[PDB]
Design a protein around this ligand. Structure first.
Ligand code: CGP
Ligand code: CGP
Lengths: 124, 124
């Protein structure tokens, strides 16, 4: 029942802060957004920009996704982000991560449904 | 089962003709599009324009729907349409309709989803 859109927010959005505020940022976040749930998600990026600016990325530079597909977009400007990487001593269920702050262009895959008619209201 | 959008085409789309052929048009189309199957749909409009053109309406003048919701759109140009309205003699299962040809702006309710981010691909 979770939309994919809401899934992206949960896994990658953190606009309440301008940067990761401590080396334990990833340990905290990866667990609170349920990314250690059934195993330790090894690589995850959190973005510290308004939801609007992130969403706007879908109207910026179209690039190929790293898996070949074409619905990826690269931000024209750098954004404050946090790289989360599972360390060499992590092991489910005690997931452990290294936290790295960065300012990079983000690249995202975007999806939607073009608006189509679904009901004839009236003619005028 | 049938999508809202597929049902809209079934009920209202007839790009294969540029206007109602005769006064029996509605009696025939209401039957073939199954709008008389279990009951007589009372009023129904068919649009004689390309699918491209009708769908582009969702990008045109936004207006309020007859029911108050705000996702209705009105075509900028008038379009060729046929009004199908039940006659006083229409009694299920012998649905009967009056065919009226016209050129007016159509108003339809549109649906879809904003193109938003759904996966984080990479940083660069
Ligand atoms: N515990 C670890 C630690 C490191 N690794 C690998 C992956 C690392 O490459 P990256 O390019 O950092 O990241 C790999 C790709 O991931 C991508 N990436 C970045 N952020 C995300 C994200 O949020 N989701 C996602 N699906 N992929 C992401 C971009 C890169 O192509 C590599 C070198 O450090 O070692 C690992 O396998 N297990
Ligand atoms: N059997 C009959 C015969 C005549 N009428 C009325 C409706 C006519 O006014 P309209 O403005 O066409 O009003 C019609 C309204 O119907 C609506 N409409 C039109 N086409 C459709 C459609 O495809 N679906 C839908 N749900 N509503 C439609 C919007 C229009 O304002 C009026 C005068 O002929 O008599 C009737 O109500 N029942």
């Amino acid at each position: 029942k979770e939309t994919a859109a809401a899934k992206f927010e949960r896994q990658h959005m953190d606009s309440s802060t301008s940067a990761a505020s401590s080396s334990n940022y990833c340990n905290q976040m990866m667990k609170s957004r349920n990314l250690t749930k059934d195993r330790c998600k090894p690589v995850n990026t959190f973005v510290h920009e308004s939801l609007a600016d992130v969403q706007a990325v879908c109207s910026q530079k179209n690039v190929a996704c790293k898996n070949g597909q074409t619905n990826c977009y690269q931000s024209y400007s750098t954004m404050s982000i946090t790289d989360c990487r599972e360390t060499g001593s992590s092991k489910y269920p005690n997931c452990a991560y290294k936290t790295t702050q960065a300012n990079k262009h983000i690249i995202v895959a975007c999806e939607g449904n073009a608006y189509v008619p679904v009901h004839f209201d009236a003619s005028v």
